[PDB]
Design a protein around this ligand. Sequence first.
Ligand SMILES: NC(=O)c1ccc[n+]([C@@H]2O[C@H](COP(=O)([O-])OP(=O)(O)OC[C@H]3O[C@@H](n4cnc5c(N)ncnc54)[C@H](OP(=O)(O)O)[C@@H]3O)[C@@H](O)[C@H]2O)c1
Ligand SMILES: NC(=O)c1ccc[n+]([C@@H]2O[C@H](COP(=O)([O-])OP(=O)(O)OC[C@H]3O[C@@H](n4cnc5c(N)ncnc54)[C@H](OP(=O)(O)O)[C@@H]3O)[C@@H](O)[C@H]2O)c1
Ligand SMILES: NC(=O)c1ccc[n+]([C@@H]2O[C@H](COP(=O)([O-])OP(=O)(O)OC[C@H]3O[C@@H](n4cnc5c(N)ncnc54)[C@H](OP(=O)(O)O)[C@@H]3O)[C@@H](O)[C@H]2O)c1
Ligand SMILES: NC(=O)c1ccc[n+]([C@@H]2O[C@H](COP(=O)([O-])OP(=O)(O)OC[C@H]3O[C@@H](n4cnc5c(N)ncnc54)[C@H](OP(=O)(O)O)[C@@H]3O)[C@@H](O)[C@H]2O)c1
Ligand SMILES: Nc1nc(N2CCCC2)c2cc[nH]c2n1
Ligand SMILES: Nc1nc(N2CCCC2)c2cc[nH]c2n1
Ligand SMILES: Nc1nc(N2CCCC2)c2cc[nH]c2n1
Ligand SMILES: Nc1nc(N2CCCC2)c2cc[nH]c2n1
Ligand SMILES: Nc1nc(N2CCCC2)c2cc[nH]c2n1
Ligand SMILES: Nc1nc(N2CCCC2)c2cc[nH]c2n1
Lengths: 250, 250, 251, 252
Amino acid sequence: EAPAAVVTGAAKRIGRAIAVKLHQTGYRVVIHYHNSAEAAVSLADELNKERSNTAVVCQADLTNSNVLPASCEEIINSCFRAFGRCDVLVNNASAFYPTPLVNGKTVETQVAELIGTNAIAPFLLTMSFAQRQSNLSIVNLCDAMVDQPCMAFSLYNMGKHALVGLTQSAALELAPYGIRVNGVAPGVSLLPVAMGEEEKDKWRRKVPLGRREASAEQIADAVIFLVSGSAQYITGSIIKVDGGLSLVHA
Amino acid sequence: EAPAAVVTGAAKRIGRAIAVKLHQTGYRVVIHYHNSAEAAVSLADELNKERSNTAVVCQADLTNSNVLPASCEEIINSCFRAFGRCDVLVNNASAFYPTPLVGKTVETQVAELIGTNAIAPFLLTMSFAQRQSSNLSIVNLCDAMVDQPCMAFSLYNMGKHALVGLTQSAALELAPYGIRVNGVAPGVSLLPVAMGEEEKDKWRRKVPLGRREASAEQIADAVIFLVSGSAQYITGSIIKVDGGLSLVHA
Amino acid sequence: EAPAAVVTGAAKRIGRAIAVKLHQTGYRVVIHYHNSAEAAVSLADELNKERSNTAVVCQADLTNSNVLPASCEEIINSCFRAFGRCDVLVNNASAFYPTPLVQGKTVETQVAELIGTNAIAPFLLTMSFAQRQSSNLSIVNLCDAMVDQPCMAFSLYNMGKHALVGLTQSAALELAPYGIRVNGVAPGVSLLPVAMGEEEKDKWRRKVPLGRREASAEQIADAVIFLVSGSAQYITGSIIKVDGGLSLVHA
Amino acid sequence: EAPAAVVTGAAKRIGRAIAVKLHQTGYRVVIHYHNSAEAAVSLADELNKERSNTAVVCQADLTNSNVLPASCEEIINSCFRAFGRCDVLVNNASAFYPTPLVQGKTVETQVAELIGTNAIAPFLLTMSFAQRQKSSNLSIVNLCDAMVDQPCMAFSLYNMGKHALVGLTQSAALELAPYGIRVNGVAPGVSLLPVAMGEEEKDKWRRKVPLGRREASAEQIADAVIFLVSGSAQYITGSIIKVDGGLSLVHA
Ligand SMILES: NC(=O)c1ccc[n+]([C@@H]2O[C@H](COP(=O)([O-])OP(=O)(O)OC[C@H]3O[C@@H](n4cnc5c(N)ncnc54)[C@H](OP(=O)(O)O)[C@@H]3O)[C@@H](O)[C@H]2O)c1
Ligand SMILES: NC(=O)c1ccc[n+]([C@@H]2O[C@H](COP(=O)([O-])OP(=O)(O)OC[C@H]3O[C@@H](n4cnc5c(N)ncnc54)[C@H](OP(=O)(O)O)[C@@H]3O)[C@@H](O)[C@H]2O)c1
Ligand SMILES: NC(=O)c1ccc[n+]([C@@H]2O[C@H](COP(=O)([O-])OP(=O)(O)OC[C@H]3O[C@@H](n4cnc5c(N)ncnc54)[C@H](OP(=O)(O)O)[C@@H]3O)[C@@H](O)[C@H]2O)c1
Ligand SMILES: NC(=O)c1ccc[n+]([C@@H]2O[C@H](COP(=O)([O-])OP(=O)(O)OC[C@H]3O[C@@H](n4cnc5c(N)ncnc54)[C@H](OP(=O)(O)O)[C@@H]3O)[C@@H](O)[C@H]2O)c1
Ligand SMILES: Nc1nc(N2CCCC2)c2cc[nH]c2n1
Ligand SMILES: Nc1nc(N2CCCC2)c2cc[nH]c2n1
Ligand SMILES: Nc1nc(N2CCCC2)c2cc[nH]c2n1
Ligand SMILES: Nc1nc(N2CCCC2)c2cc[nH]c2n1
Ligand SMILES: Nc1nc(N2CCCC2)c2cc[nH]c2n1
Ligand SMILES: Nc1nc(N2CCCC2)c2cc[nH]c2n1
């Protein structure tokens, strides 16, 4: 019987690649999404055409609010409902935009989105994952540049730092239950086609290893390693997949 | 004219020692507090008896909420109202209790622990900066054990990690305004007055340097250094004041 | 044809597991050793019995000295002589013993051995490896998860391991233009020997959150195999703990 | 009676600033030097002019070798010979130059100088400082580097040496705590550019620094040393204070 995985923010880009790779590895998957309904449903349809009854979608807003714990429990619940088990949680969903210290979004909203998606939802999901329980593990999508942050991204950066601490705290606390908790920390990865070519080049030429971005598949490869039988003594580790970017001085 | 400082959670213990030392160095102080109203008022009284109208109190819950931004803005405003300037912000107030992964609701624990330890500091930092011989700085009370966290303290530890991220982000972003942003990271300092001495001795015995906890004053001494003219090129630094505790293996 | 790897200190324990797993993966291997000659030769015999002409031995002391650069050059050269290429270098050899700061090897001999094996030799091997340079070239350095919470009285060992973190990052940056990746694997507690008592072993095992046991040599080797593989082609400068959570545990 | 300090590499630049501040704060000082004998004796003269019999020079090569442990012991012994005590050690001496991995000095020499000055000598100085101990505020301050995790291209040996020094700072803080000896570091970013250096190269470095687009002064580095040795840092051990104007926070 096939294990099952929840991948948050899995309708497109890096989360989608992670879902695809877990599916190719033999996992059944819950494709969580927020706004990307068509892409999510299309992805589930493709995966089920490949192997029947192996993919479902699950919609949720992961912005912080008083109902977020119930939304996070329901995501985990949805994996048990479809597949009867939940072996892997990948916390990939993430809001990302600048919040200068000095658009129509209120600061209350920025806090809720940036800290909710990057940190609090990962925490609540982790809680519900553990509570609802083989090679069980969680993989948090972190950020290789967390200690050399981009200008004006304080709330996003706080979120991702929080996620490091969660990865560590949950690894320690969940180890007695046989649940491993690790991270993958991308540097520059899968720049959107629509992003300006000059801006894409500016970022790509920062990367010592090949002067290029990571593919989504390269990021997925590190997730696949961490959930695998070859990582069974690894917990609390965060693997940078950054081409050396984080090592480069100003 | 004398400089002014805001100290959050300044009624008792470490926040009080910081307030007192800043006042002894010649600062006017805002004594922020939440529940410890008697202690906050009598402290301000003691300081004002020493030098007339050099201390004021300002009450506010720093739990995350829709009204938290306005609260933080009003704390910085009270400094300007009292003293016409705000040179130093010390983010010391902090909720601290366990939140195991397996009567407060979790969404309330999220609000209190992430609010006090991270989101209020961010909002105070915004309000501080927006209001801007000059020697402006922020000191954030961090935690030397943030990478070796206590069992069952996920939310607290996430909060403190987010606080390291804020320290670094804001140091980078506010540097052009001449505002320095640093941290002080205690390990074991004052233990609860209610905690039995024999239990206190179990924390104390872990500390390499003298097998005892830090005084409030020892913590305050690092804060005084960082706000001083002797630290004018120091920004984004977090100084452990931990007696070596963070270096001690399991 | 098959890629080739050098593994230092490969006769026993973790080094041997790394060599075996690389060989299983399709690599030809140079088994470097210092004193463990019988085990090195026995290992080469076993691997060659699986596939002919895929394992050789190279003896060298990796203590720091005036002759270490040449020794390191010869270790790399042993791989080219045998196999005609050198794709992977694994810096695993390591001296390990206490060097109390406050008081019969002389201190200069302890410096030589501990800094030599853990840091200078890996630097010199890295130089010789790079100088000899589609392909998938990489270096994996065996680091230590407890490098920031070091054991009492192990200053020189700990200095050597910190210096190795430095080399890992410095070499990642500098060799990236050549497509040579440089990474680390950081064990916590692994394969405790008979030379240790039950109290002492239980003391260490019991600290580990994930199962209250040491890592097997194979588990350390698994992380090495990943870093060397095509699945880690964008990874350089990364150090992967394989420590069961040990490093996260406060005092 | 005044406490005494050893400052390695103290004839000029940052080491001098440290020795001076220590002296002014009331320390008697051993000014260690390797090649800058004229600069060392001249500083000892100024300081002795301020207060008689409160400074001496001490020459030593801190390159790794089999006699380095004796050289380090003699530096400490020299503080006790002159002053009867040794309360503070500042490990500041440092060789600094590139050592490319892919192709002057032999590599054996590069290793000896860069690992010797930046790491092994500090270890041996620390051992001798501790061993020789017989109110008190004993400490050691190691001059580290804020950019140790974002190394400059082709500086692998120098970087290894500074990383080792981090490890020593931590290890020795742990092991010497029971003797009341605190061990800390100061990690400069960009500090005191040689007048030698070209206008354009100085500018490239200055422009990197978020806090005022300027390098640190020697005095600014020395201020952080003085803090760590002071009674205001009595519970601090094993800490490394960056003094870098935010340089280490700036991404590529
Ligand atoms: N260079 C990089 O791209 C890079 C660098 C460092 C780290 N990372 C990390 O790697 C992961 C994947 O990166 P990416 O570039 O693929 O991310 P992305 O395109 O920015 O977003 C991933 C998903 O997050 C979901 N999300 C956003 N806000 C949400 C909300 N309020 N509630 C629920 N879900 C929400 C979105 O779902 P819908 O589309 O369904 O709305 C989106 O598809 C992220 O955790 C990211 O931080 C990426
Ligand atoms: N003590 C230690 O060993 C230790 C160790 C590591 C880090 N630290 C850090 O050092 C700082 C001081 O430590 P401490 O032990 O003195 O702190 P504490 O006594 O636990 O808390 C300090 C103050 O935080 C304020 N506070 C708590 N919840 C609040 C809320 N919801 N809204 C507004 N204010 C709130 C309280 O104000 P009222 O009393 O007025 O309600 C309290 O007096 C903290 O940031 C702490 O995390 C301390
Ligand atoms: N075991 C652990 O728990 C642990 C924890 C943290 C890190 N590590 C790291 O993981 C790696 C493997 O650990 P391990 O326990 O397998 O190592 P180990 O048994 O202590 O030693 C590995 C090998 O190093 C070689 N070596 C020692 N001194 C040498 C010298 N002067 N010149 C050349 N080679 C020398 C020895 O070769 P000969 O036998 O041929 O003489 C020995 O087989 C090491 O780098 C270690 O530091 C291990
Ligand atoms: N300058 C910066 O931007 C910067 C940045 C990061 C860290 N740092 C650190 O801060 C400290 C001081 O910086 P600096 O720029 O003032 O240093 P520096 O000018 O490069 O040299 C300091 C001293 O080290 C001594 N030294 C060099 N090789 C030696 C040897 N073989 N034996 C004994 N002594 C030797 C020299 O003594 P003689 O002159 O007597 O030969 C020299 O005076 C160093 O530890 C350095 O790495 C500096
Ligand atoms: N959620 C998220 N998205 C990101 N991106 C969305 C498309 C441009 C990159 C980045 C980039 C660094 N951290 C990120 N986190
Ligand atoms: N790791 C990372 N990448 C980033 N980018 C790479 C793709 C576009 C921006 C940004 C941007 C703000 N913080 C970031 N952190
Ligand atoms: N806000 C806060 N209080 C704390 N304490 C108050 C009662 C004794 C400990 C600690 C301890 C570690 N981090 C802390 N943070
Ligand atoms: N070279 C080496 N050997 C080690 N060991 C050999 C006997 C069991 C532990 C350890 C342990 C931590 N780092 C180590 N490094
Ligand atoms: N010993 C030393 N000297 C340095 N310098 C001497 C003259 C130019 C900078 C630097 C610079 C970074 N680390 C350093 N270490
Ligand atoms: N902090 C720092 N500064 C540096 N420099 C300062 C001006 C000359 C070089 C270098 C050079 C190699 N590593 C360095 N680290």
